[PDB]
């Protein structure tokens, strides 16, 4: 399915709202401030993911390895560069309070690889 992001007008830099031309029934995105309009390609207006089935690796940032508080391990090497050291923690976020799955971040600079076993 995927997610849908908003579109901006090229004239006033305002968001394009969903609209439709009955004559051709082609998904249009018409800015409701001015007369500008555009032809969509996603063919999707709104999605609501209840299962919130998303990857925490996207939210995980690679600069967290410089935290003198989180634990470190040498038993989970980085797959991208083979570095032995890694920093691990939990999801520690809402809708992810369970699933104690450990999220590992490579300690070596310029790699910042984030992965999960």
């Amino acid at each position: 399915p995927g997610f849908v992001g908003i579109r901006f007008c090229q004239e006033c830099n305002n968001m394009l709202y969903p609209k439709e031309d009955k004559e051709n029934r082609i998904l249009l995105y018409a800015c409701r401030n001015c007369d500008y309009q555009q032809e969509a390609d996603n063919s999707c207006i709104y999605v609501n993911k209840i299962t919130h089935e998303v990857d925490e690796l996207t939210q995980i940032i690679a600069d967290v390895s410089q935290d003198p508080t989180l634990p470190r391990t040498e038993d989970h090497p980085c797959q991208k560069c083979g570095h032995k050291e890694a920093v691990f923690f939990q999801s520690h976020s809402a809708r992810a309070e369970d699933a104690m799955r450990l999220y590992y971040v490579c300690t070596a600079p310029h790699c910042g690889h984030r992965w999960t076993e």
Partner: protein, 62 residues
């Protein structure tokens, strides 16, 4: 910040945390109290000066 709290990306702040808390000793307490009192004094002085000006005579500061 309100958004991140809504999606749960950030945790709601707790009042009991002392990082979110500050202490008020004699210094700030007196300053705050004095500030109100000094203004009251200014007003009193302004009232006296205004009434003397309305009466037409200059007012002695003392």
């Amino acid at each position: 910040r309100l958004l991140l709290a809504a999606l749960g990306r950030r945790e709601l702040d707790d009042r009991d945390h002392y990082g979110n808390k500050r202490l008020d000793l004699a210094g700030p307490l007196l300053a705050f109290l004095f500030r109100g009192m000094f203004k009251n004094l200014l007003k009193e002085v302004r009232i006296y000066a205004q009434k003397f000006i309305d009466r037409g005579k200059d007012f002695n500061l003392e």
